[PDB]
Amino acid sequence: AKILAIDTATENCSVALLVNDQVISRSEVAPRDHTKKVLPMVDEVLKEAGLTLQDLDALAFGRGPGSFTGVRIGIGIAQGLAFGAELPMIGVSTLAAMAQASYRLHGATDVAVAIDARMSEVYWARYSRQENGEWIGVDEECVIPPARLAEEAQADSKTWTTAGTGWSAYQEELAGLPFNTADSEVLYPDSQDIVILAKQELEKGNTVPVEE
Amino acid sequence: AKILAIDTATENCSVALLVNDQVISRSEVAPRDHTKKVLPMVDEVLKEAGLTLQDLDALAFGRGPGSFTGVRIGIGIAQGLAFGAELPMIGVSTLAAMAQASYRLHGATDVAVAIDARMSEVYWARYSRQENGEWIGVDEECVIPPARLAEEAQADSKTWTTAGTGWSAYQEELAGLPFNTADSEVLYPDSQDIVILAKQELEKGNTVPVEE
Numbered sequence: 001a002k003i004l005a006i007d008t009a010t011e012n013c014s015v016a017l018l019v020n021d022q023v024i025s026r027s028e029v030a031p032r033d034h035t036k037k038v039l040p041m042v043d044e045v046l047k048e049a050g051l052t053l054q055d056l057d058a059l060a061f062g063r064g065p066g067s068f069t070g071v072r073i074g075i076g077i078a079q080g081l082a083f084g085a086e087l088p089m090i091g092v093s094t095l096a097a098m099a100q101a102s103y104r105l106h107g108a109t110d111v112a113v114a115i116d117a118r119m120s121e122v123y124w125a126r127y128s129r130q131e132n133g134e135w136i137g138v139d140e141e142c143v144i145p146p147a148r149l150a151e152e153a154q155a156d157s158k159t160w161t162t163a164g165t166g167w168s169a170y171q172e173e174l175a176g177l178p179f180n181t182a183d184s185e186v187l188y189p190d191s192q193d194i195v196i197l198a199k200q201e202l203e204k205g206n207t208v209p210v211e212e
Numbered sequence: 213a214k215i216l217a218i219d220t221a222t223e224n225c226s227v228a229l230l231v232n233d234q235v236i237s238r239s240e241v242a243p244r245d246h247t248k249k250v251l252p253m254v255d256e257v258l259k260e261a262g263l264t265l266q267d268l269d270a271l272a273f274g275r276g277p278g279s280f281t282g283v284r285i286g287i288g289i290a291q292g293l294a295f296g297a298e299l300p301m302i303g304v305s306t307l308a309a310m311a312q313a314s315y316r317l318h319g320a321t322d323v324a325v326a327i328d329a330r331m332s333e334v335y336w337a338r339y340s341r342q343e344n345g346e347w348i349g350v351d352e353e354c355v356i357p358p359a360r361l362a363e364e365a366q367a368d369s370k371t372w373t374t375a376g377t378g379w380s381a382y383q384e385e386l387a388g389l390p391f392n393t394a395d396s397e398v399l400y401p402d403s404q405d406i407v408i409l410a411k412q413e414l415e416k417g418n419t420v421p422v423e424e
Contacts (some may be wrong), residue, residue, distance in 0.1 A: 035284065039291055039423045053296045069281050072247065076285045079251055080292010084265045211251045 002056045003198050004042065004081075005191040008034050008074025009066025009094045010115070010165070015041040016191035017056075018199055019049055025192040034073050042081070053085035058207060060198035062189055063091030065115060065123035065143065079210065088207040090198040095125040096135055098163040100193035101186050103129065110158055111135075112181070114146075114166025114174065122146045122166040122174075134200065150176035164188070214268045215410050216254065216293075217403040220246050220286030221278025221306045222327070222377070224400035227253040229268075230407045231261050237404045246285050254293070265297035270419060272410035274401055275303035277327060277335040277355065291422065300419040302410040307337040308347055310375045312405035313398050315341065322370055323347075324393070326358075326378025326386065333357045334378040334386075346412065362388035376400070 003018045013030035015038060016023050026041040046052065053059075061078040064071040071094075082089050099111035109129035117123050124142050127135035139153065146166065150173060159180035165187055167174060201207060213233070219226045225242035227250060228235050238253040258264065265271075273290040276283040283306075294301050311323035321341035329335050336354050339347035351365070358378065362385060371392035377399055379386055413419060 035287060035291065036423070039295055042295070043423075069284060072281060073284050073288045076247060076288030077292040079247065080289040080294075081296050082292075083251055083254070084293050084296025211248070211255075 001199060001202070002051060003058045003060055003090070003195050003202070004045065004053075004056050005060040005092070005194040005198060006038060006042070006074045006078045007062035007094075007097070007189055007191050007194055008038065008070045009062040009064055010070070010188040012188035012190060013037050013041075014189075014191040015045055016195050017045045017049060017051070018195045019051060023192055023195055024048055025190070027190060034070055038074065038077055053081055053087070056085065056087060058090055058198060058202055059085070059087045060090035060092055060194055062094050062097060062194060064094055065117070065141070066094045082210045087210065089210055089212055090201050090207050091212065092194045092197050092201075093125070093141065094189045095123065095141060095164070096127050097189035097194050097197060098186055099127045099135055100197055101190055102161050102163050102184055104193060105185065106161060108161035108182070110160045112160035112162050112179065113164045114162065116165035116169040117143055120145055122149065122170065124149060124166065126160060146170040146173040150174070153177075155179065213411060213414075214263060215270045215272055215302070215407050215414070216257065216265075216268050217272040217304070217406040217410060218250060218254070218286045218290045219274035219306075219309070219401055219403045219406055220250065220282045221274040221276055222282070222400040224402065225249050226401075226403040227257055228403035228407050229257045229261060229263070230411055231263060235404055235407055236260055237402070239402060246282060247289075250286065250289055265293055265299070268297065268299060270302050270410060270414055271299045272302035272304055272406055274306050274309060274406060276306055277329070277353070278306045294422045299422065301422055301424055302413050302419050303424060304406045304409050305337070305353065306401045307335065307353060307376070308339050309401035309406050309409060310398055311339045311347055312409055313402055314373050314375050314396055316405060317398065318373055318396065320373040320394070322372045324372035324374045324391065325376045326374065328377040328381040329355055334361065334382065336361060336378065338372065358382040358385035362386070365389075367391065
């Protein structure tokens with residue numbers, strides 16, 4: 001179960017490595033650039049483990065949504081390094097990714113992810129931890145102006161723990177629909193969790209090739 | 213002398229491979245995306261040569277200028293692939309790159325590269341082929357509004373073959389200074405030429421590590 005993940009999707013540049021239920025995580029809440037940090041971290045991660053790229057049996061990545069430039073860049077490195085160790089690959093949703101963090105720290109089964117898209121819109125989904133440890137998609141991945149989100153889907157009555165930067169960027173507007181809600185201390189996805197999501201795609205045989 | 217170059221700087225996505233004075237080139241005048249074409253080409257290149265990444269003794273890349281997203285993306289793959297074959301690397305100027313093409317087709321020793329920056333400015337340099345085959349930098353790499361370029365530097369009296377997309381996007385304005393000039397059929401850099409530039413950085417011992 002040897003997986004190495006990269007994420008470059010939001011403000012947080014992160015790289016982590018699962019080697020048999022032992023996730024050594026690296027993170028950096030990043031700037032205008034990304035390249036300059038992503039390799040050295042992958043190097044750090046691996047030396048602190050004695051693995052090589054061809055040791056790993058999968059290479060995982062934030063597939064987005066998230067920043068256009070950024071989310072491309074990391075996929076670009078994630079291909080680069082896969083190609084050379086002949087690795088299969090695993091794309092992983094930034095949204096569901098943040099749902100896992102919300103379990104990891106808060107033990108929440110009910111997660112509402114809202115990522116601040118640019119120009120007045122929001123990347124949104126909701127997920128729901130099912131018995132297996134998986135996440136039933138309670139709402140499809142969308143991009144919506146939060147206003148419209150509020151008047152669509154009356155949906156349920158449940159305590160959704162809110163994650164990602166949509167929340168703090170459009171309160172006025174996400175303030176408008178009875179779902180129960182809870183603050184989260186979570187802003188961005190992290191490769192910590194991304195791995196643990198990827199670790200179950202393997203066990204479902206759900207990996208692409210290398211040129212996805 | 214085994215070098216593989218990637219370029220993703222302008223509208224032209226290109227990958228080529230020098231294996232002993234034999235450059236098998238791949239090119240594609242590309243769209244809104246880049247990832248999807250860059251790997252397969254690097255794969256194509258290598259099968260039609262029986263080399264692997266760890267066969268090569270350097271991996272080169274367009275360092276830019278050029279499109280922000282683009283130029284990051286290629287650099288991102290060119291690190292990814294370097295890292296896994298433990299390769300040294302070689303960044304290469306898109307401008308001087310296009311100077312080489314202008315030799316390759318037209319045999320020009322006097323090149324004026326102007327790339328259409330966005331928002332009313334231009335990426336510009338001038339190079340001059342010295343006896344060795346190197347290129348004296350007749351003007352430092354810049355980013356100027358073409359207007360200002362015209363009234364700066366009276367400079368010389370010589371026949372500069374113009375390349376890159378500045379020329380056709382600001383004629384009125386680049387039309388204003390006596391240098392002699394000649395049309396070129398050249399618009400973007402190509403990994404064809406990038407390699408032959410890289411092949412000489414090696415011979416000067418001028419390669420960075422892998423996390424440049």
